[PDB]
Amino acid sequence: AKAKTRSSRAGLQFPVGRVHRLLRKGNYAERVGAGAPVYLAAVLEYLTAEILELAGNAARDNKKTRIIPRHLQLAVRNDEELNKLLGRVTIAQGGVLPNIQSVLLPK
Amino acid sequence: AKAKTRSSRAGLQFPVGRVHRLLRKGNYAERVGAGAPVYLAAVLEYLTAEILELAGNAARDNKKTRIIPRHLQLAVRNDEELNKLLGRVTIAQGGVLPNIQSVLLPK
Amino acid sequence: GAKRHRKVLRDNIQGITKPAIRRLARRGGVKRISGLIYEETRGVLKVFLENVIRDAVTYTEHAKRKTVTAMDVVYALKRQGRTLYGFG
Amino acid sequence: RDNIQGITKPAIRRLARRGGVKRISGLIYEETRGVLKVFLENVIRDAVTYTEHAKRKTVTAMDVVYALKRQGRTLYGFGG
Amino acid sequence: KPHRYRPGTVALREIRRYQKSTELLIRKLPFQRLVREIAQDFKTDLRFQSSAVMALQEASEAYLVALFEDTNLCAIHAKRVTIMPKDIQLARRIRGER
Amino acid sequence: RYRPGTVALREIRRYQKSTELLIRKLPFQRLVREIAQDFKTDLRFQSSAVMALQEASEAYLVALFEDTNLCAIHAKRVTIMPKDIQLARRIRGER
Amino acid sequence: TRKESYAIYVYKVLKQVHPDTGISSKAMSIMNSFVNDVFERIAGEASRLAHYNKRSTITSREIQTAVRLLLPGELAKHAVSEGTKAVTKYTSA
Amino acid sequence: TRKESYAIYVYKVLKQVHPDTGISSKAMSIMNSFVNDVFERIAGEASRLAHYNKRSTITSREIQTAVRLLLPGELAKHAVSEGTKAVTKYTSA
Amino acid sequence: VGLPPHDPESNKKRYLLKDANGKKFDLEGTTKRFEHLLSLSGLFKHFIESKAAKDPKFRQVLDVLEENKESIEFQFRESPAYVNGQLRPYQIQGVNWLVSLHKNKIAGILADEMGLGKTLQTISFLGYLRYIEKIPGPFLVIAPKSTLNNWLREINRWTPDVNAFILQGDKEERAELIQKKLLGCDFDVVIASYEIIIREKSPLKKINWEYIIIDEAHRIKNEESMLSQVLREFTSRNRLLITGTPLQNNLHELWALLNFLLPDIFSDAQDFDDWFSSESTEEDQDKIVKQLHTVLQPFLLRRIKSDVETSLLPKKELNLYVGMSSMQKKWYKKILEKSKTRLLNIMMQLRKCCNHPYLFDGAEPGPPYTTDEHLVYNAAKLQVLDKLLKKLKEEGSRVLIFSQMSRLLDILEDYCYFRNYEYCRIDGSTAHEDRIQAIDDYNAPDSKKFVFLLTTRAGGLGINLTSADVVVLYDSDWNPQADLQAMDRAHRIGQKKQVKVFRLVTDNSVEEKILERATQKLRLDQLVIQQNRIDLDELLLKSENKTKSLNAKYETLGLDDLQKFNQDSAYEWNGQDFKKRERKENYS
DNA sequence: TCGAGAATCCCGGTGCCGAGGCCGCTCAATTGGTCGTAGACAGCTCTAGCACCGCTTAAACGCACGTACGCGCTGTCCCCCGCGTTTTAACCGCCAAGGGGATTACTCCCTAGTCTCCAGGCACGTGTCAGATATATACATCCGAT
DNA sequence: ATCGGATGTATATATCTGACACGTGCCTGGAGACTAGGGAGTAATCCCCTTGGCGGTTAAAACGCGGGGGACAGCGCGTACGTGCGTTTAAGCGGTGCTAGAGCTGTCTACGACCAATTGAGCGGCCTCGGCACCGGGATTCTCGA
Ligand SMILES: Nc1ncnc2c1ncn2[C@@H]1O[C@H](COP(=O)(O)OP(=O)(O)O)[C@@H](O)[C@H]1O
Ligand SMILES: [Mg+2]
């Protein structure tokens, strides 16, 4: 028969043979189940979709049509859950979320 | 032939066969060299001896001939680099290093 | 009179009494304590427990057990970077 | 001569502002120099160890990424 | 007149007492009730060991003691000797779990 | 002439808005090689390594200054002083 | 020389969500590193989770539990929903 | 069943350093946890080191680099010295 | 008469244990007692074949007893001369039995029926030990706190001369009592309590105890009871156990009590257990029974009221197999199948709904909360309770209600207030003075308290309720004797009118399961110890049949299957096989 | 304004209970054969890293004025502490039960491993457009005088 | 207070220019097909430990009080920091010169895995006694109004 990719059967976009290969030749355990690469690929794809959605939102909010690292880092820091997941992560060429202490403002 | 332990050949006191088995059935890698368990057992035994000596010194300072977790924490937190090694570690039934801020002492 | 509706007081977080807060404070090394440290402390303690217990229960679920055994709690604390020596 | 004095007064001032700081004491510059030096020594020591193991004599970016990861502060971007 | 210690001495005696002892400082049953009541949320019908609850109490008290030490440093840093909630918020925000 | 405290806020906006590096390049690279000179002599650096080091240094110092600023404000001030660095760094957990 | 990457897959997902938006190269590297980092986090947690139970296989249950343990809040909810959906659709075929 | 432990070996080391001393049960449990924890840290770092360099074996050099990475300052050099001693003695059987 | 006085200096040479380490196997006494044991009956060797393979010392013990292989005692068949009173014959018989055990260097559990005056037998026997055997003291006594005062009130009643005191009070007053009298050696008999005994171990070890009496012996069942552990350190010559009835639920219990009496015969459990359940096949179970009778016959003394003194309309019982009310149906389903409630440990939860659903969270509708007919409207047990309660009231019989959970007692408080009855409650949290006042007011000869509530666990104390005549019990207990003494509370010596127990029972609920288990245990006891010596009428008639069926079923079953206790899961109940997201608006 | 009083360290005797020593039994470490293959080593190429000149341009250095803020003093008052009294609820001892945690045995499905085959993905060009940058303009804000 | 002024900032427009999205060919890794074997599923067993309730001792917690010392607001002052202008020096960019340092192929060969056997090291269960806890009493000491 013709070869029909495991990704397509899953319906995902991220590879499954590649995830399978890494989980196997990565010394995580002796034997890798059949369904595990499918699950992991789906989860990685979902997280990527979230990050890119928020980042594209921010990029549009600056009249630009390309996510640059500043947009990634800004979108990540604005959200709370992504900000907690990547808490100890410094995104290179990101920057600081704009913030002024109210006490500092003139009166 | 007579059976001679690998520990004896090394001269150590921790088991090199048990460390070997744990290094193997541990999915750290798929081959474990002959001289790795020896070197590792030596390091583990050195650290044990160091912390035990400090704990025993503390015990004698407290006029005791046993070692209780309080002495273990006194030894660990009084030393400097041992304190860095066990930085995030909580020792159950330990206690606290005696310390009062200087500002709070009466005039 | 008609009395069958007995309720419970000091719900469960008020069980961390004022003097227990004071004792923990003294071991911490403080001398004077304001009046609003008690509520703030109960809040922070409750948050910490929520996180740790959530991870412990996840571990218990996975192994198909129904008893949160000690080694699960040790694993959960370790996963948060609060390694605990003394229970396995 | 005085490499850590290469961290000028205004550069520390820029960093302070990006942190959100308005007025600055005159003594902050020396302590900032000290803090930066300690951080650099830790990371560089671990990176050099990593490159020792691999027998090389150059510190590639991926080694520094590993060292930072080990310190407890990841760095997306350069690595991978 | 009766002997009455001046404000401040008894607190220092208590600090010495509790920095030299090593027992637990929160009562058992109140803490166990708190733990089970919290855990009712995530999965109904759970049962605990005893070592599990003791481990939880050890970790809890250690965490709170460390927090109070940092709180005390903050309070002293503001030219005070009294700890107030603002000190705790500052301490936790600095630590990194705001 | 701007009243004192005016230009500072505009500096803060300028820098909290941008993304570039703030420390010069060569002073930091010299510092890196000089510090590394101790652990092993005759050592080379790939440039991407120095860029990584500068990114990490920038981020560490920026977060440090935010916590310093919070400590200063907590003591009812707007000036930052060395005691603030020391307090913030000890609380954070490296003393 | 072959440096494998999640470039084309990330870009497929991006075209899926924001159809007329690009992505830079530094942004691409950051996203790839992010995918690798979260991959090793999940895989390592699943490995430890299997070893704890004296088990010698990485099933899908281990992946699900690692997802529940690392991801915070409703990221966990939506991610487990996605994984379950994909594995079901897979086995059906 | 049969719980493995380091209790006996810790006792032998203790009798070496402070011959006229004892150790309670809790302290022994703490020491056992300490040993497993340090073994786990060293072995995990050596595993990562081997993976980073495409190696497939955990040799002595991996353990030495891992112990030089974990332990701080004086501990590192003393432990390295003593491990090297033991390996030479064993290999010159 | 004929004894040295309480010269404390004289006593200190006898009370204090001079050789603080001196303690040996006592081979001679072991051999003597074990020889007499084998003399009266021969199976007792079955202990030694095992324990000798267990003991290298029992090698030579068996040897010594095996190479070899005042005829009438002082039949003290009179009211004791020194005791200032009169004794009814079986009292004297028990006294003679105690003396006879004394002579054979052993002792036995006294386990007579309650109200038979056991402590009078004990005081008489100790007085015998003093006046006749020229041994003043010391002795120790352990009792329930409630009866701490009764022991002394009767010590200073029959044999006034002897000295006794109580370690009653908190730390300072007990401590001064210790130092003054106890270590001053100014007594002959002590009276402590269970908690006291556990709390005064360090001084009370320092005395060459002659006996260790224990009122309410059955408290020593779990051989890891820290009370038992403590009592295994008090060096003594012999012991004594007093209990209304031993062998509460399990058979291992009697081995435990025997361990207390004679730890140098019953020293091992495996032999007892296997010898007992040593016939998996069921032809020799009768022989096993006769063996156990011939084993325990010497040690144990047991008496019955129903044969020592009549004048006691025996009692009678009915087990009203009531149905289930509607919301009880729905709540039973909800509990079985399914908001913090912690539904685990459900067999208690079932006992909650099966008595009254209001015990849960808001089963009664509201707020507002109102007392009205909706109480009894939908609680089957409470329905039949109201019906029978009215029938008793029109006859006018004071009623005692027992329960397991005091929350049901509070529900009954509300319901009693609803129905214009004066009730009286003595629960576990009641204060002592409140307790005595309440029981006196109920026991006033002119009392209007129709109902007297109390929990069954608290009902076993020294409280006396001979006044009433019906002792209706909501739910059967796990231990049939546990509530049997509660039922006895109203059938003690002094009650004339017939007692009319009404243990309430539900159908298809766990209540039948629990009742079956209780009946099994009661049958076990009876076998082992007996041979040693809407409309109320229609429900009554229906229930007086299935109870006959159950007692007939358990009337003759094999000992083996009697203790098997099939784990018949109650989880049937007619059939059952269980047990996007937020996005920021603008990022400008 | 030093003597009274309350907390503390030391010594001493005693009790008790947990650490350490012995003893059998089993399985996992050692011996000892074999043998595959990781990795060590020696060819290969290619390319990025190392002390000197010249030039532009801006950021760093230095300095003077003033000003507002950090620091110190004072007062005020009110919050928190030390303490004596009373209630209450841990804590230990206890009773009951059954769940479910850990163990064993057997079968089979699923997974590793081999062969075979082909197509998804990766590196190498490549064109064009999204964003940076400079300019000029409009407008928003700060600030001192009136 | 307001206003006009000056300054800095947000906005629209034209230009480029360097990176991104695209297209191709090749190859290696994933998919199809098949076999064998062992890990995990699933029954079934045992008994350890959990679950709720109750009772008594005793210390801790709750409560109210009296009073002082510290938290906070207000004032002054003087000092060190900011702002702005003028100077200068160093970063950055570019270009010279070289070579070692780090990444590909092909061949062993020693060493780590697998397998059989078999013995002894280690684990569990059972003792006994000494180190620690408990207690009582006495001298020392620090605190606090005279
Ligand atoms: N002369 C007597 N002969 C027999 N019994 C008596 C005599 N005098 C008093 N009694 C009863 O003997 C009882 C002894 O206590 P008892 O009720 O047997 O305690 P328990 O309930 O523990 O068996 C007393 O309660 C008393 O009523
Ligand atoms: Mg009695």
Side-chain angles (χ1 to χ4, degrees), chain I residues 280-320:
Chain I
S280 180
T281 187
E282 272 87 0
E283 76 280 11
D284 202 82
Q285 78 300 339
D286 292 336
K287 272 70 69 179
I288 297 312
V289 164
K290 75 174 186 51
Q291 285 168 60
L292 195 51
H293 282 91
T294 199
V295 164
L296 295 174
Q297 187 69 92
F299 293 99
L300 188 153
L301 177 54
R302 174 54 217 270
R303 261 77 63 79
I304 45 176
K305 173 41 167 55
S306 84
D307 187 43
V308 52
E309 150 63 276
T310 55
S311 327
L312 232 328
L313 176 25
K315 62 148 154 187
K316 65 202 294 184
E317 306 83 354
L318 288 174
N319 297 320
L320 275 68

Coordinates of all heavy atoms in Angstrom, one line a residue, chain I residues 280-320:
Chain I
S280 N -10.3 -27.9 59.8 CA -10.9 -27.3 58.6 C -12.1 -28.1 58.2 O -13.2 -27.5 57.8 CB -9.9 -27.2 57.5 OG -10.5 -26.6 56.3
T281 N -12.0 -29.4 58.2 CA -13.2 -30.3 58.1 C -14.0 -30.3 59.4 O -13.4 -30.0 60.5 CB -12.8 -31.7 57.7 OG1 -14.0 -32.4 57.4 CG2 -11.9 -32.3 58.7
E282 N -15.3 -30.6 59.3 CA -16.2 -30.2 60.4 C -16.8 -31.4 61.1 O -18.0 -31.4 61.3 CB -17.3 -29.3 59.9 CG -16.9 -27.8 60.0 CD -16.1 -27.3 58.8 OE1 -15.9 -28.2 57.9 OE2 -15.8 -26.2 58.7
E283 N -16.1 -32.5 61.4 CA -16.6 -33.6 62.2 C -16.1 -33.5 63.7 O -16.8 -34.0 64.5 CB -16.2 -34.9 61.6 CG -14.7 -35.3 61.9 CD -13.8 -34.6 60.9 OE1 -14.2 -33.7 60.2 OE2 -12.6 -34.9 60.9
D284 N -15.0 -32.9 63.9 CA -14.4 -32.8 65.2 C -14.6 -31.5 65.9 O -13.9 -31.2 66.9 CB -12.9 -33.1 65.2 CG -12.3 -33.6 66.5 OD1 -12.5 -34.8 66.8 OD2 -11.7 -32.8 67.2
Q285 N -15.5 -30.6 65.4 CA -15.7 -29.3 66.0 C -16.3 -29.5 67.4 O -16.0 -28.7 68.3 CB -16.5 -28.4 65.1 CG -18.0 -28.7 65.1 CD -18.4 -30.1 64.6 OE1 -17.6 -30.8 64.0 NE2 -19.5 -30.6 65.0
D286 N -17.2 -30.5 67.6 CA -17.8 -30.7 68.9 C -16.7 -31.2 69.9 O -16.7 -30.8 71.0 CB -18.8 -31.8 68.8 CG -20.1 -31.3 68.1 OD1 -20.3 -30.0 68.0 OD2 -20.8 -32.1 67.6
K287 N -15.7 -32.0 69.4 CA -14.6 -32.4 70.2 C -13.7 -31.2 70.5 O -13.2 -31.0 71.6 CB -13.8 -33.5 69.5 CG -14.3 -34.9 69.8 CD -15.6 -35.1 69.2 CE -15.5 -35.2 67.7 NZ -16.8 -35.5 67.0
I288 N -13.6 -30.2 69.5 CA -12.8 -29.0 69.8 C -13.5 -28.2 70.9 O -12.8 -27.7 71.8 CB -12.7 -28.2 68.5 CG1 -11.9 -28.9 67.5 CG2 -12.1 -26.8 68.8 CD1 -10.6 -29.5 68.0
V289 N -14.8 -28.1 70.9 CA -15.6 -27.4 71.9 C -15.4 -28.0 73.3 O -15.1 -27.3 74.3 CB -17.1 -27.4 71.5 CG1 -17.9 -26.9 72.7 CG2 -17.3 -26.4 70.4
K290 N -15.5 -29.4 73.3 CA -15.3 -30.0 74.6 C -13.9 -29.9 75.1 O -13.6 -29.8 76.3 CB -15.7 -31.5 74.5 CG -14.7 -32.4 73.8 CD -15.1 -33.8 73.9 CE -14.1 -34.8 73.3 NZ -12.7 -34.5 73.9
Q291 N -12.9 -29.8 74.2 CA -11.5 -29.6 74.5 C -11.4 -28.2 75.1 O -10.7 -28.0 76.1 CB -10.6 -29.7 73.3 CG -10.3 -31.1 72.8 CD -9.7 -31.1 71.4 OE1 -8.6 -30.5 71.2 NE2 -10.4 -31.7 70.5
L292 N -12.0 -27.2 74.5 CA -11.9 -25.8 75.1 C -12.6 -25.7 76.4 O -12.0 -25.0 77.3 CB -12.4 -24.8 74.0 CG -12.0 -23.4 74.2 CD1 -10.5 -23.2 74.4 CD2 -12.4 -22.6 73.0
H293 N -13.7 -26.3 76.6 CA -14.3 -26.4 77.9 C -13.4 -27.0 78.9 O -13.2 -26.5 80.0 CB -15.6 -27.2 77.9 CG -16.8 -26.4 77.4 ND1 -17.1 -26.3 76.1 CD2 -17.6 -25.5 78.0 CE1 -18.2 -25.5 75.9 NE2 -18.5 -25.0 77.1
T294 N -12.7 -28.2 78.6 CA -11.8 -28.8 79.5 C -10.5 -28.0 79.6 O -9.7 -28.3 80.5 CB -11.5 -30.2 79.1 OG1 -11.0 -30.9 80.2 CG2 -10.5 -30.3 78.0
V295 N -10.3 -27.0 78.8 CA -9.1 -26.2 78.9 C -9.4 -25.1 79.9 O -8.7 -24.9 80.9 CB -8.7 -25.6 77.6 CG1 -7.8 -24.4 77.8 CG2 -8.0 -26.6 76.7
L296 N -10.5 -24.3 79.7 CA -10.7 -23.1 80.5 C -11.5 -23.3 81.7 O -11.7 -22.4 82.5 CB -11.5 -22.1 79.6 CG -10.7 -21.6 78.4 CD1 -11.5 -20.7 77.5 CD2 -9.4 -20.9 78.8
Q297 N -11.9 -24.6 82.0 CA -12.7 -24.8 83.2 C -12.1 -24.4 84.5 O -12.7 -23.7 85.3 CB -13.1 -26.3 83.2 CG -14.1 -26.6 84.3 CD -15.5 -26.0 84.1 OE1 -16.3 -26.7 83.5 NE2 -15.7 -24.8 84.5
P298 N -10.8 -24.7 84.8 CA -10.2 -24.3 86.0 C -10.1 -22.8 86.2 O -10.5 -22.2 87.2 CB -8.9 -25.0 86.1 CG -8.5 -25.1 84.7 CD -9.8 -25.4 83.9
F299 N -9.6 -22.1 85.2 CA -9.2 -20.7 85.3 C -10.3 -19.8 85.6 O -10.2 -18.9 86.5 CB -8.5 -20.2 84.0 CG -7.2 -20.8 83.7 CD1 -7.2 -21.9 82.8 CD2 -6.1 -20.4 84.3 CE1 -6.0 -22.4 82.5 CE2 -4.9 -21.0 84.0 CZ -4.8 -22.0 83.1
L300 N -11.5 -20.0 85.0 CA -12.5 -19.0 84.9 C -13.7 -19.3 85.8 O -14.1 -20.4 85.9 CB -12.9 -18.8 83.4 CG -13.8 -17.7 83.0 CD1 -13.6 -17.3 81.6 CD2 -15.3 -18.0 83.3
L301 N -14.2 -18.2 86.4 CA -15.4 -18.3 87.2 C -16.4 -17.4 86.5 O -16.2 -16.3 86.1 CB -15.2 -17.8 88.6 CG -16.4 -17.8 89.5 CD1 -17.1 -19.1 89.5 CD2 -16.0 -17.4 90.9
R302 N -17.6 -18.0 86.3 CA -18.7 -17.3 85.6 C -20.0 -17.6 86.3 O -20.3 -18.8 86.6 CB -18.8 -17.7 84.1 CG -20.0 -17.1 83.4 CD -20.1 -15.6 83.6 NE -21.4 -15.1 83.7 CZ -22.2 -14.8 82.7 NH1 -21.7 -14.8 81.4 NH2 -23.4 -14.3 82.9
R303 N -20.9 -16.6 86.5 CA -22.1 -16.8 87.1 C -23.2 -16.0 86.4 O -22.9 -15.2 85.6 CB -22.1 -16.4 88.6 CG -22.0 -17.5 89.6 CD -20.5 -18.0 89.6 NE -19.6 -17.0 90.1 CZ -19.5 -16.7 91.4 NH1 -20.2 -17.3 92.3 NH2 -18.6 -15.7 91.8
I304 N -24.5 -16.4 86.6 CA -25.6 -15.8 85.9 C -26.6 -15.4 87.0 O -26.9 -16.1 87.9 CB -26.2 -16.8 85.0 CG1 -26.4 -18.2 85.6 CG2 -25.4 -16.9 83.7 CD1 -27.1 -19.2 84.8
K305 N -27.4 -14.4 86.6 CA -28.3 -13.9 87.5 C -29.4 -14.7 87.3 O -30.2 -15.0 88.2 CB -28.8 -12.5 87.1 CG -30.0 -12.0 88.0 CD -29.7 -12.3 89.5 CE -30.7 -11.5 90.3 NZ -32.1 -11.7 90.0
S306 N -29.6 -15.2 86.2 CA -30.8 -15.9 85.9 C -30.6 -17.3 86.5 O -31.1 -18.2 86.0 CB -31.0 -16.1 84.5 OG -30.3 -17.2 84.0
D307 N -30.0 -17.3 87.7 CA -30.0 -18.6 88.3 C -29.5 -18.5 89.7 O -29.3 -19.5 90.4 CB -29.1 -19.5 87.5 CG -29.1 -20.9 88.0 OD1 -30.2 -21.4 88.3 OD2 -28.0 -21.5 88.1
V308 N -29.2 -17.3 90.1 CA -28.7 -17.1 91.4 C -29.7 -16.4 92.2 O -29.8 -16.6 93.4 CB -27.5 -16.2 91.4 CG1 -27.8 -14.9 90.7 CG2 -27.0 -15.9 92.8
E309 N -30.5 -15.7 91.6 CA -31.6 -15.0 92.3 C -32.6 -14.7 91.2 O -32.3 -14.1 90.2 CB -31.0 -13.8 92.9 CG -32.1 -12.7 93.0 CD -33.2 -13.1 93.9 OE1 -34.2 -13.7 93.5 OE2 -33.1 -12.7 95.1
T310 N -33.8 -15.0 91.5 CA -34.8 -14.8 90.5 C -35.3 -13.4 90.8 O -34.5 -12.5 90.7 CB -36.0 -15.7 90.8 OG1 -36.5 -15.5 92.1 CG2 -35.6 -17.1 90.6
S311 N -36.6 -13.3 91.0 CA -37.1 -12.1 91.3 C -36.7 -11.2 90.1 O -36.6 -10.0 90.3 CB -36.5 -11.5 92.6 OG -36.2 -12.6 93.4
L312 N -36.6 -11.7 89.0 CA -36.3 -10.9 87.8 C -37.0 -11.3 86.6 O -36.6 -12.1 85.9 CB -34.8 -11.0 87.5 CG -34.2 -9.6 87.4 CD1 -35.2 -8.6 86.9 CD2 -33.7 -9.1 88.7
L313 N -38.2 -10.6 86.4 CA -38.8 -10.9 85.2 C -37.7 -10.8 84.1 O -37.1 -9.8 84.0 CB -39.9 -9.8 85.0 CG -40.7 -9.8 83.7 CD1 -40.7 -11.2 83.1 CD2 -42.1 -9.4 84.0
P314 N -37.4 -11.9 83.4 CA -36.4 -11.9 82.4 C -36.6 -10.9 81.4 O -37.7 -10.3 81.5 CB -36.6 -13.2 81.7 CG -37.3 -14.1 82.7 CD -38.2 -13.2 83.5
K315 N -35.7 -10.6 80.5 CA -36.2 -9.5 79.7 C -36.7 -10.1 78.3 O -36.5 -11.3 78.1 CB -35.2 -8.5 79.4 CG -33.9 -9.0 78.7 CD -33.3 -7.9 77.8 CE -31.8 -8.1 77.7 NZ -31.2 -7.0 77.0
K316 N -37.3 -9.3 77.5 CA -37.8 -9.7 76.2 C -37.4 -8.6 75.2 O -37.3 -7.4 75.6 CB -39.3 -9.9 76.2 CG -40.1 -8.7 76.4 CD -41.5 -9.0 76.9 CE -42.3 -9.8 75.9 NZ -43.7 -10.0 76.3
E317 N -37.3 -9.0 73.9 CA -36.8 -8.1 72.9 C -37.6 -8.3 71.6 O -38.1 -9.3 71.4 CB -35.3 -8.3 72.6 CG -34.4 -8.3 73.8 CD -34.4 -9.6 74.5 OE1 -35.2 -10.5 74.1 OE2 -33.6 -9.8 75.4
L318 N -37.7 -7.2 70.9 CA -38.3 -7.2 69.6 C -37.5 -6.4 68.6 O -36.9 -5.4 69.0 CB -39.8 -6.7 69.6 CG -40.8 -7.7 70.3 CD1 -42.1 -7.0 70.4 CD2 -40.8 -9.0 69.5
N319 N -37.4 -6.9 67.4 CA -36.5 -6.3 66.4 C -37.4 -5.8 65.3 O -37.6 -6.5 64.3 CB -35.5 -7.2 65.9 CG -34.5 -7.7 67.0 OD1 -34.1 -6.8 67.9 ND2 -34.2 -8.9 67.1
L320 N -37.9 -4.6 65.4 CA -38.9 -4.0 64.5 C -38.3 -3.7 63.2 O -37.7 -2.7 63.0 CB -39.6 -2.8 65.1 CG -40.7 -3.0 66.1 CD1 -40.2 -3.6 67.4 CD2 -41.3 -1.6 66.4

